[PDB]
Curated annotation (Swiss-Prot), chains A, B:
This is Propionyl-CoA carboxylase beta chain, mitochondrial. This is one of the 2 subunits of the biotin-dependent propionyl-CoA carboxylase (PCC), a mitochondrial enzyme involved in the catabolism of odd chain fatty acids, branched-chain amino acids isoleucine, threonine, methionine, and valine and other metabolites. Propionyl-CoA carboxylase catalyzes the carboxylation of propionyl-CoA/propanoyl-CoA to D-methylmalonyl-CoA/(S)-methylmalonyl-CoA. Keywords: Acetylation, ATP-binding, Disease variant, Ligase, Mitochondrion, Nucleotide-binding, Phosphoprotein, Transit peptide. The modification N6-succinyllysine is found at K114, K129. The lineage of its organism: Eukaryota, Metazoa, Chordata, Craniata, Vertebrata. It is found in: Mitochondrion matrix. Belongs to the AccD/PCCB family. One of its GO terms (molecular function) is propionyl-CoA carboxylase activity. It comes from the Eukaryota. It comes from Homo sapiens.
Amino acid sequence: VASGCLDINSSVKGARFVRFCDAFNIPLITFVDVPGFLPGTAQEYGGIIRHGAKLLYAFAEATVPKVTVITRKAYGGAYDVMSSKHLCGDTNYAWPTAEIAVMGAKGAVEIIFKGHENVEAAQAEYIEKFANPFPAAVRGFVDDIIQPSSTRARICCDLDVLASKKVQRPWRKHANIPL
Amino acid sequence: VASGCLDINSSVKGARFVRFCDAFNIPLITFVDVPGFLPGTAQEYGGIIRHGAKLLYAFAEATVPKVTVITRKAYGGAYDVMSSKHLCGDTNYAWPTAEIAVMGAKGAVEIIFKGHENVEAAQAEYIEKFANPFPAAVRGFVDDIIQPSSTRARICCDLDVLASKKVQRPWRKHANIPL
Ligand SMILES: *C(=O)CCCC[C@@H]1SC[C@@H]2NC(=O)N[C@@H]21
Ligand SMILES: *C(=O)CCCC[C@@H]1SC[C@@H]2NC(=O)N[C@@H]21
């Protein structure tokens, strides 16, 4: 549905569910495949910026175990919104088809290589190096790249060892979610 | 005295003083100029490894304001031992003569460029780029490079705003300093 893109309505449902599970110590499993946000004036006039921040906050605030699996696409700011490891996640696995980037190869090459000759060669070079899960994994964004058939067993193992995990957070009178 | 090198005796005196000042909310000011550790069997047989860890711990544990000024040399592991910014420091200033490196240019070039022709050119290139305070500052190791005449005023300003600073640390029954 809608290429797996985030919009206002999806952000509202996600943030509410995540917030409940965190409050009552229920671990979270995230399956990420998101190419970006739904474009258009229907979303911009509706406050897509304000509403998208709801899901980002709901994950960032969480203190319960978070296990993320990236199945195919994670472009742009949506990578971090869908519970990336940099929001105090516990484990993050990629399948062999995962691709983590600011944008797809076509947009990135047209912007990076502007006015140069032999752009088609630059397009092939960029895709071969960046259109896979490796530029993120070699940086510590992904803990392992796993065969999909092993996903269940890998998650079960993490759940049975993160269950006793506690973290500290500064004192606050109460949270201030963007609303 | 002894080129400003750390040894067993200096580590013992430092750790004890730092620990007292931290316990009773007295800010710390550090003036760093340390080329490394005193070599030789007299120090190795005396447990220089064990004793040096005392000063590293004493700074790392501290929760009171820490302001560090680097005047000239900070080579090797001694950089971090003498209250570097990466031990939860508040501010760290360098004077124009500061040099932060793993080792001096002579040792580094002989190790990096081994068996190559025109080593003398490599020596000049290395010194011009790394024998100054810039490769550390551009990475976030140093907050500013200041004229020495302004040091006092800069420190006074930091002390009058860090005085109300509190940090959180996980619960512990009691500390376990290497001894
Ligand atoms: C064709 O150029 C339309 C591109 C839309 C691709 C998807 S839709 C939502 C995401 N936002 C974006 O700019 N690209 C993604
Ligand atoms: C001559 O080669 C002796 C070099 C000693 C220079 C100083 S003394 C202590 C520090 N340790 C080290 O390897 N170099 C520094």
